[PDB]
Design a protein around this ligand. Structure first.
Ligand SMILES: OC[C@H]1O[C@@H](OC[C@H]2O[C@@H](O)[C@H](O)[C@@H](O)[C@@H]2O)[C@H](O)[C@@H](O)[C@H]1O
Ligand SMILES: [Mg+2]
Ligand SMILES: [Mg+2]
Ligand SMILES: [Mg+2]
Ligand SMILES: [Mg+2]
Ligand code: NA
Ligand code: NA
Ligand code: NA
Ligand code: NA
Ligand code: NA
Lengths: 1015, 210
């Protein structure tokens, strides 16, 4: 029957014998345990060691396995993904389905995981009441047997499947057999851009309920205009035999204080001509001046639902955390508790580099702490309902959640082929309805989402209206079909740009500013995805935040995304390395496109995270004379755990510093008057830095946490006093092949055939391993490469235009190389043409001026042909002989910063170990740049000017040629890149040109100047 | 004190090279102890007669962004025509040059002055690579205006009919020039991308004889 029916190839069957969905249950038999959320003896975990056997297809599974253990089976930890145990490969594909697109059919070679468990059930559990099993996550479909007898079937990998085991269990030893299919018709709705894995990957448990039971309960909170009064409404449903003596009590608790309580017999109000629900009751509780829930202040109450007898005997209790909050769209603005939200959001997949898609409390808490520490207030469940604990933590720590149905059909042609098909409505409906039934009582959930990237079909409209009808308390959003369809309350585009239109046919992405004011448009706009953080990315992030703050109806967005989906592999010595698509023999695959995070898989931050933190700051600053104006962007809280630290420095040298406590109302302003600042003796630029410090620890941060900062230039005093004339005079030695300049134990050698400084000598020691040459290219970033699907190439991608123009092949040709003797200096003058196939791309004209102080002044003037693609950089590079421990610089830092991602960086004196000047992106590229640098120090060397630099043991060439960070080898000496100019990194998306015009090197002619001396 | 600031000499040297003479200068403009601008130049006169002027300017970050960064002088010559390769034919400024076209333009001197009834800076042409006036040729990438009226006379005169042609021709050659604005005329209206806020500036000119 099971083999004959092939339920995993029928979108009409998504389950057999599955119980109704409901909010989290524990079936407490003690009300105090329910109130305090203590463990329940009636809820038992079946996690731990199970037996497992892998088969190529369900037809290969031997019938004996139903009755007893396969000796060939292994013992494995559950929950798990079986790919993480090496039974078969995980597959990384983005859009293209990992199976032949032939709905509803799946491949006959369908990897089958056979799980089994021998466990004890006590007689007391079977003598009375109902024993159910709960599978919180099984990917992608499964049949269940208990003691040899078929129980049921379930689909949807991301929501719990529950089965009554009461009639299948016996006292003592029992055995479960779970046959998990990798592919099913459910897979057609599970095409999320992530690793394709499978197995029993979330918790398994047993729940005992009495026959007469709470089967469902819903909590609503309604308010008066100023939120000074609330009504808590709790609808409760029962199963079992109705009796006149039955009662329901709902009590509300604030800490250990009961604030309200209501008791009633079962029997609802009349709803129609046939009467009402005899098996339901609605309790209403008045709450005066409730403490309101928000991400700022996650005030929670506890609601306890008791089913009992009139004379006071408890039958069972259930409970949940209650957050008093209202979510509504009014006059085009998303309001929370009557105030317009500014969504500082991120998309977060459930990903672990070791455990695959198995989630644990520790990883969840770590993510929430890092998010809040980095000024995020919201998370999107991309693209499926999460592990139930996630919502509990978001309720308690305070994050706004978009809960999203497990529906994505990206790979269909066209995208709505299934979602417009009424045959797939039943399957889709269960993924929406069962999510709502499970999660509707969580205060952290503020928006429902119909799924991701499934076009726009009539099925979406139907399910949109279903949610609006059963839950008016939360807006519904959905991006598919152009982000502004009739199935969405919020305009929610992905990767719409700030100012630039992208007018794609049928599904255009307008400038977000333009989108708001399209004829007839009234809704708020919140990007469901923006600022694709793939590798060296997040260029232009500040442009989004400037716009969010200026336009009321631009209420923010969710960054894509939180954590890199890299997986751990091991080399021959057991050393771990980060792997991506294609590294598991998985084919076809989309390579590094699974890595888009602000953080590495182990939660180490990318440089981009600090840019996100800074732009998402909750305090804004302005400087007028001696006055700092601090504006609060909080909606509810006073700044009761904040102090402002100010510092004035002169080219990195502290001059004055102080601190003022912040006392700012939400949305309010505070003026801080700086004291008279003492005039500095020396020449240079004075800088003001302010930072907001949290003196006290919180649930989410340590004491001394910095939450905001900002810098301004103050007075500058230009250096007019000339250096005292050095007595020494350098000597020029000319030969046919070289111009040599000597000054004591110092030599500079200029090759006359090439026109470059080919060597420098301090005594008898070489300083250079490679000549100092011009460089106009970079090891391409993920954004430069611009590939979202390994097959497709965009001829407009920067890397493509650079390659086609011959930028990486360009050969320097010497035009001019002359030497002159001045009164107190030697002057070398060079000119080079960079050419590809007859065409001149760049001309570099230089002067090197070497004086008696041993300083080499380099002047560079570059012409770039207007019809060549704008170059990635205009600079010089060399391989230094020296390998030193520290890099010291005056400029923007401390972290990696690029022209379109430097707002978070502060100007100061920074000192780091060499290794910190390299960012270990899993896919290697140009990295570690620091901008706005006036002075750089490394070993014996000093460079001065106004430049950008990176410094490391890896050449651009190695970075360009190496696909994985772990394959990089330290080269001899240190590679230095010093740029007068560097192109933006982009990131608005990572699959088309995304570098804004103001950050492209389009000026045609460029000038920069450097002084190289010995420190 | 931008209108009051006087040049103070810091450096002025000369060096004889293989086929050229090199003059190196440095100046500071100051107002009441404050250094507003620093100008560093090299003049390179070679055996062909061409004088290459390389100019590098520093502008104090805390002084109001300057209206222009360039050079001026009063030529002895009064010529009939002005011939340039650049944007024209009409007056154009950095934030008002979209109408102008790049080409070879030849106008009488009088067309290089705009007779605004209230006299001001006027007649600028931007994006110029070559300027010809009598025997003189300037090459580079600059903005220029040329007329019989000095910036000072324009500044001191309230009506165009009271202007008098000065001896010779005033030439202003700018490496950089501030936008003119006009979103309104009663508040600062020049957009940030057209303000001279970069701090450090570079331009080069080649002066020779036709
Ligand atoms: O990492 C990408 C991220 O963005 C979302 O869209 C994916 C992207 O895929 C490309 O192949 C298409 O050309 C483009 O239309 C589309 O934006 C997606 O919602 C995320 O889950 C994730 O794939
Ligand atoms: Mg099915
Ligand atoms: Mg997708
Ligand atoms: Mg615990
Ligand atoms: Mg034009
Ligand atoms: Na806004
Ligand atoms: Na991706
Ligand atoms: Na405070
Ligand atoms: Na690479
Ligand atoms: Na005037």
């Amino acid at each position: 029957v099971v083999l004959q029916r092939r339920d995993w190839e029928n979108p009409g069957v998504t389950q057999l014998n599955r119980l109704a969905a409901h909010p989290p249950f524990a079936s407490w038999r003690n009300s105090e345990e329910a109130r305090t959320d203590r463990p329940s003896q009636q809820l038992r975990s079946l996690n731990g060691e199970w037996r497992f056997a892998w088969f190529p297809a369900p037809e290969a599974v031997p019938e004996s396995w139903l009755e007893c253990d396969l000796p060939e089976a292994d013992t494995v930890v559950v929950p798990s993904n079986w790919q993480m145990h090496g039974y078969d490969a995980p597959i990384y594909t983005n859009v293209t389905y990992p199976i032949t697109v032939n709905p509803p059919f799946v491949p006959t070679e369908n990897p089958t995981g056979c799980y089994s468990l021998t466990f004890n059930v006590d007689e007391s559990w079977l003598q009375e009441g109902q024993t159910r099993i709960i599978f919180d996550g099984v990917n992608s479909a499964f049949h269940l047997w208990c003691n040899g007898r078929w129980v049921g079937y379930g689909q949807d990998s991301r929501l719990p499947s529950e089965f009554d085991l009461s009639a299948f269990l016996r006292a003592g030893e029992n055995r479960l057999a779970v046959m998990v299919l990798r592919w099913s018709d459910g897979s057609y709705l599970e095409d999320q851009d992530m690793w394709r894995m499978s197995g029993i990957f979330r918790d398994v448990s047993l729940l005992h309920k009495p026959t007469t039971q709470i089967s469902d309960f819903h909590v609503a909170t309604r308010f008066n205009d100023d939120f000074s009064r609330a009504v808590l409404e709790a609808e409760v449903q029962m199963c079992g035999e109705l009796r006149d003596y039955l009662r329901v009590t709902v009590s509300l608790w604030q800490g250990e204080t009961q604030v309200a309580s209501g008791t009633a017999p079962f029997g609802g109000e009349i709803i129609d001509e046939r009467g009402g629900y005899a098996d339901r009751v609605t309790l209403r509780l008045n709450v005066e001046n409730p403490k309101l829930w928000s991400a700022e202040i996650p005030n929670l109450y506890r609601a306890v639902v008791e089913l009992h007898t009139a004379d006071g005997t408890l039958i069972e209790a259930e409970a949940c955390d209650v957050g008093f909050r209202e979510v509504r769209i009014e006059n085009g603005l998303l309001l929370l508790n009557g105030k317009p939200l500014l969504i500082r959001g991120v998309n977060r997949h459930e990903h672990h580099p070791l455990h695959g898609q198995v989630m644990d409390e520790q990883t969840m808490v770590q993510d929430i702490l890092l998010m809040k520490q980095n000024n995020f207030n919201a998370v999107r469940c991309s693209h499926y309902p999460n592990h139930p604990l996630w919502y509990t933590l978001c309720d308690r720590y305070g994050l706004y959640v978009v809960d999203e149905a497990n529906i994505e059909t990206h790979g269909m042609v066209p995208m709505n082929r299934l979602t417009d098909d009424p045959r797939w409505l039943p399957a889709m409906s269960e993924r929406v309805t069962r999510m709502v039934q499970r999660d509707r009582n969580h205060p952290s959930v503020i928006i429902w989402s119909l799924g991701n990237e499934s076009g726009h079909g009539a099925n979406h409209d139907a399910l949109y209206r279903w949610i609006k009808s059963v839950d008016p308390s939360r807006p519904v959003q959905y991006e598919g079909g152009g982000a502004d369809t009739t199935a969405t309350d919020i305009i929610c585009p992905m990767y719409a740009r700030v100012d630039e239109d992208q007018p794609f046919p049928a599904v255009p992405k307008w400038s977000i500013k333009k989108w708001l004011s399209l004829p007839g448009e009234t809704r708020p706009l919140i990007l469901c995805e923006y600022a694709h953080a793939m590798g060296n990315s997040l260029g232009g992030f500040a442009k989004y935040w400037q716009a969010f703050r200026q336009y009321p109806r631009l209420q923010g967005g969710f960054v894509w995304d939180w954590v890199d989906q890299s997986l751990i592999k091991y080399d021959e010595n057991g050393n771990p390395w980060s792997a991506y698509g294609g590294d598991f023999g998985d084919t076809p695959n989309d390579r590094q496109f699974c890595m888009n995070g602000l953080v590495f898989a182990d939660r180490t931050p990318h440089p981009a995270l600090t840019e996100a933190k800074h732009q998402q700051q909750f305090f804004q600053f302005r400087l007028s004379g001696q006055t700092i104006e601090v504006t609060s962007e909080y909606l509810f809280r006073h700044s009761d755990n904040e102090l402002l630290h100010w510092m004035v420095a002169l080219d990195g040298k502290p001059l004055a510093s102080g601190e003022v406590p912040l006392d700012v109302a939400p949305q309010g302003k505070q003026l801080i008057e700086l004291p008279e600042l003492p005039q500095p003796e020396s020449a240079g630029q004075l800088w003001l830095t302010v930072r907001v410090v949290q003196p006290n620890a919180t649930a989410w941060s340590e004491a001394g946490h910095i939450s905001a900062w900002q810098q301004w230039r103050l007075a500058e005093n230009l250096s007019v006093t000339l250096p005292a004339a050095s007595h020494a005079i350098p000597h020029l030695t000319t030969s046919e092949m070289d111009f040599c300049i000597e000054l004591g134990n110092k030599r500079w050698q200029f090759n006359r055939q090439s026109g470059f400084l080919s060597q420098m000598w301090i005594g008898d020691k070489k300083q250079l391993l490679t000549p100092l040459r011009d460089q106009f290219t970079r090891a391409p970033l993920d954004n430069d490469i611009a590939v979202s699907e390994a097959t497709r190439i965009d001829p407009n991608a920067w890397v493509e235009r650079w390659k086609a123009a011959g930028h990486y092949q360009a050969e320097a040709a010497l035009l001019q190389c002359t030497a002159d003797t001045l009164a107190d200096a030697v002057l070398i003058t060079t000119a080079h043409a960079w050419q590809h196939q007859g065409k001149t791309l760049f001309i570099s004209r230089k002067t090197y001026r070497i004086d008696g102080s041993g300083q080499m002044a380099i002047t560079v003037d570059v012409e770039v042909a207007s019809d060549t693609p704008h170059p990635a950089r205009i600079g010089l590079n060399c391989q230094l002989a020296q390998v030193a421990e520290r890099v010291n610089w005056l400029g923007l830092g401390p972290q990696e910063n690029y022209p379109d991602r430097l707002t978070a960086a502060c100007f100061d004196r920074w000192d780091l170990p060499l290794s910190d000047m390299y960012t270990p992106y899993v896919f290697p590229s140009e990295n570690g740049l620091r901008c706005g640098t006036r002075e750089l120090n490394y070993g014996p060397h000093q460079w001065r000017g106004d430049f950008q630099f990176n410094i490391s043991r890896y050449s651009q060439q190695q970075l360009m040629e190496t696909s994985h960070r772990h394959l990089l080898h330290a080269e001899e000496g240190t590679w230095l890149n010093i740029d007068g100019f560097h192109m933006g990194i982009g990131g608005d998306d990572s699959w088309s040109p995304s570098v804004s015009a103001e950050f492209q090197l389009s000026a045609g002619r460029y000038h920069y100047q450097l002084v190289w001396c010995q420190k």
